[PDB]
Amino acid sequence: EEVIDFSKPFMSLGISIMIKKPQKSKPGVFSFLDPLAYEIWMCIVFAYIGV
Amino acid sequence: AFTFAAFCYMLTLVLCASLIFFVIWHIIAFDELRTDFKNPIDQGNPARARERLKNIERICCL
Protein backbone atom coordinates (compact mmCIF):
# COMPACT_ATOMS: atom_id res chain seq x y z
CA GLU A 1 0.00 0.00 0.00
CA GLU A 2 3.00 2.31 0.44
CA VAL A 3 3.84 2.02 -3.27
CA ILE A 4 0.45 1.24 -4.83
CA ASP A 5 -3.22 1.79 -4.02
CA PHE A 6 -5.69 -0.99 -3.24
CA SER A 7 -9.45 -1.21 -3.44
CA LYS A 8 -11.74 -2.37 -0.70
CA PRO A 9 -11.44 -6.16 -0.46
CA PHE A 10 -13.59 -8.03 -2.95
CA MET A 11 -13.06 -11.23 -0.95
CA SER A 12 -12.20 -11.54 2.73
CA LEU A 13 -10.54 -14.66 4.08
CA GLY A 14 -8.12 -15.92 6.71
CA ILE A 15 -6.06 -18.84 7.90
CA SER A 16 -7.85 -22.15 8.37
CA ILE A 17 -7.25 -25.84 9.02
CA MET A 18 -7.32 -28.63 6.42
CA ILE A 19 -7.64 -32.24 7.55
CA LYS A 20 -8.32 -35.55 5.87
CA LYS A 21 -11.98 -36.49 6.02
CA PRO A 22 -12.68 -38.84 8.94
CA GLN A 23 -13.38 -42.30 7.56
CA LYS A 24 -15.22 -45.30 8.90
CA SER A 25 -12.65 -46.32 11.48
CA LYS A 26 -11.44 -49.89 11.28
CA PRO A 27 -13.37 -51.63 14.07
CA GLY A 28 -11.30 -52.12 17.18
CA VAL A 29 -10.89 -55.23 19.25
CA PHE A 30 -13.31 -54.82 22.15
CA SER A 31 -15.61 -52.60 20.11
CA PHE A 32 -18.43 -54.77 21.49
CA LEU A 33 -18.20 -52.75 24.73
CA ASP A 34 -18.80 -49.42 22.96
CA PRO A 35 -22.60 -49.36 23.44
CA LEU A 36 -22.02 -48.86 27.18
CA ALA A 37 -19.51 -46.59 28.87
CA TYR A 38 -16.64 -48.15 30.79
CA GLU A 39 -18.07 -46.86 34.06
CA ILE A 40 -21.26 -48.85 33.43
CA TRP A 41 -19.21 -52.00 32.88
CA MET A 42 -17.26 -51.52 36.11
CA CYS A 43 -20.44 -50.79 38.06
CA ILE A 44 -21.85 -53.98 36.55
CA VAL A 45 -18.84 -55.98 37.74
CA PHE A 46 -19.00 -54.62 41.26
CA ALA A 47 -22.79 -54.94 41.46
CA TYR A 48 -22.30 -58.59 40.52
CA ILE A 49 -19.79 -58.91 43.36
CA GLY A 50 -22.07 -57.15 45.82
CA VAL A 51 -25.19 -59.11 44.89
CA ALA B 1 -23.79 -36.45 39.75
CA PHE B 2 -24.06 -40.23 39.84
CA THR B 3 -20.77 -41.91 38.96
CA PHE B 4 -18.70 -45.02 39.59
CA ALA B 5 -17.29 -43.76 42.90
CA ALA B 6 -20.73 -42.92 44.26
CA PHE B 7 -21.98 -46.41 43.47
CA CYS B 8 -18.91 -47.87 45.17
CA TYR B 9 -19.70 -45.77 48.24
CA MET B 10 -23.33 -46.92 48.25
CA LEU B 11 -22.34 -50.58 48.00
CA THR B 12 -19.72 -50.24 50.74
CA LEU B 13 -22.30 -48.48 52.90
CA VAL B 14 -24.66 -51.42 52.45
CA LEU B 15 -21.90 -53.95 53.15
CA CYS B 16 -20.50 -52.19 56.24
CA ALA B 17 -23.70 -52.97 58.13
CA SER B 18 -22.64 -56.60 57.79
CA LEU B 19 -19.27 -55.83 59.37
CA ILE B 20 -21.02 -53.98 62.20
CA PHE B 21 -23.22 -57.04 62.71
CA PHE B 22 -20.17 -59.31 62.75
CA VAL B 23 -18.28 -57.24 65.32
CA ILE B 24 -21.39 -56.94 67.49
CA TRP B 25 -21.69 -60.73 67.37
CA HIS B 26 -18.00 -60.97 68.29
CA ILE B 27 -18.40 -58.77 71.36
CA ILE B 28 -21.56 -60.58 72.46
CA ALA B 29 -19.82 -63.95 72.19
CA PHE B 30 -16.82 -62.63 74.11
CA ASP B 31 -19.11 -61.19 76.79
CA GLU B 32 -20.59 -64.67 77.14
CA LEU B 33 -17.07 -66.11 77.30
CA ARG B 34 -16.22 -63.62 80.06
CA THR B 35 -19.40 -64.54 81.93
CA ASP B 36 -18.20 -68.15 81.77
CA PHE B 37 -14.59 -67.33 82.70
CA LYS B 38 -14.82 -64.74 85.48
CA ASN B 39 -17.63 -66.86 86.90
CA PRO B 40 -16.36 -69.84 88.91
CA ILE B 41 -14.76 -72.41 86.62
CA ASP B 42 -15.25 -75.35 89.00
CA GLN B 43 -15.85 -78.52 86.97
CA GLY B 44 -16.79 -80.93 89.74
CA ASN B 45 -19.91 -82.08 87.91
CA PRO B 46 -18.91 -84.06 84.79
CA ALA B 47 -22.10 -82.89 83.08
CA ARG B 48 -21.36 -79.25 83.94
CA ALA B 49 -17.78 -79.56 82.68
CA ARG B 50 -18.96 -81.17 79.44
CA GLU B 51 -21.60 -78.47 78.90
CA ARG B 52 -19.11 -75.66 79.52
CA LEU B 53 -16.52 -77.24 77.22
CA LYS B 54 -19.04 -77.73 74.43
CA ASN B 55 -20.29 -74.15 74.81
CA ILE B 56 -16.72 -72.88 74.52
CA GLU B 57 -16.07 -75.07 71.48
CA ARG B 58 -19.31 -73.96 69.82
CA ILE B 59 -18.53 -70.28 70.33
CA CYS B 60 -14.99 -70.76 69.02
CA CYS B 61 -16.31 -72.57 65.93
CA LEU B 62 -18.84 -69.79 65.34
> DSSP alpha helices (H): ranges in B1-62?
4-38, 46-61
Q: Considering only CA atoms, which of B15, B16, B11 is closest in space to residue A45?
A: B11
Separation between Cα atoms, residue B6 and residue A6, nearest integer Å: 65
Residue of A nearest to B7 (CA): A43
Interface contact B4-A47, CB threshold 8 A: no
Is residue B42 within 8 Å of residue B61, measured between CB atoms? no
Residue of B nearest to A38 (CA): B4
CA-to-CA separations, B12 to A25, B15, B23, B34, in angstroms, rounded: 40, 5, 16, 32
Structure method: cryo-EM
Resolution in A: 3.1
Residues written for chain B: 62
Using the Cβ of A46 and the Cβ atoms of chain B, whether some distance falls under 8 Å is answered with yes
Separation between Cα atoms, residue B9 and residue B1, nearest integer Å: 13
Long-range contacts of A39-45 (CB under 8 A, 24+ apart): A39/B3, A39/B4, A42/B4, A43/B4, A43/B7
Separation between Cα atoms, residue A50 and residue B25, nearest integer Å: 22
